[PDB]
Write a protein that binds this ligand. Structure first.
Ligand SMILES: Nc1ccn([C@H]2C[C@H](O)[C@@H](COP(=O)(O)O)O2)c(=O)n1
Ligand SMILES: [Cl-]
Ligand SMILES: [Zn+2]
Length: 183
């Protein structure tokens, strides 16, 4: 029912090797949980993935589709993004997400990023702006990559195969992100 990602597209876009060139696209896998007094309700209708299209970054395209999710404003939600690049500032993503979180205080956001989008001169301000708007931002580790493979990919029951250096790159990126976000 929910359309599943090609496995080579996954591997190519979520690779966290710092030397691989893959700026041209961003893949954003999302899920929404409704929190019903300590109880999480996570429905497949609120799960999917998006990439950039017509020059519009995937994060903005996620914001475009929030009305279609039909979230009840009387309820509390946690959205999680597994995203191949952390959000930018200069093409509007961090500021639109901040505005979204400020307008929708019934929604909380967790962003798990495979790599840091440092092509933007203001990338650190982007990450800090997301943190300060209440988003929990972190770097994807083995556990997250495996979850995404298992959840969003057309894997035909086949297990996640971690690429060489996955852990080393993830811990390195995590150090860099935690230094940016230190409070
Ligand atoms: N630990 C780091 C910090 C910055 N950089 C890169 C990201 C940018 O392309 C460039 C300038 O970053 P900054 O403005 O944060 O110093 O260096 C990196 O590759 N590794
Ligand atoms: Cl982290
Ligand atoms: Zn962006």
């Amino acid at each position: 029912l929910r359309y599943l990602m090609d496995p080579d597209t996954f591997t190519s876009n979520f690779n966290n090797d710092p030397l691989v060139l893959r700026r041209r696209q961003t893949y954003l896998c999302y899920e929404v949980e409704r929190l019903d007094n300590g109880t999480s309700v996570k429905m497949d209708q609120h799960m999917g993935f998006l990439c950039n299209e017509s020059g519009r970054h995937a994060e903005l395209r996620f914001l475009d589709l929030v009305p279609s999710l039909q979230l009840d404003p009387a309820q509390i939600y946690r959205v999680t993004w597994f995203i191949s690049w952390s959000p930018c500032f200069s093409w509007g993503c961090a500021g639109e997400v901040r505005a979204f979180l400020q307008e929708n205080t019934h929604v909380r956001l967790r962003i798990k990023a495979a790599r840091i989008y440092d092509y933007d001169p203001l990338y650190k301000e982007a990450l800090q702006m997301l943190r300060d708007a209440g988003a929990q931002v972190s770097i994807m580790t083995y556990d997250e990559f495996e979850y995404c493979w298992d959840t969003f990919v057309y894997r035909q029951g086949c297990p996640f195969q971690p690429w060489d250096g996955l852990e080393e790159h993830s811990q390195a990126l995590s150090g860099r992100l935690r230094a940016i976000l230190q409070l």
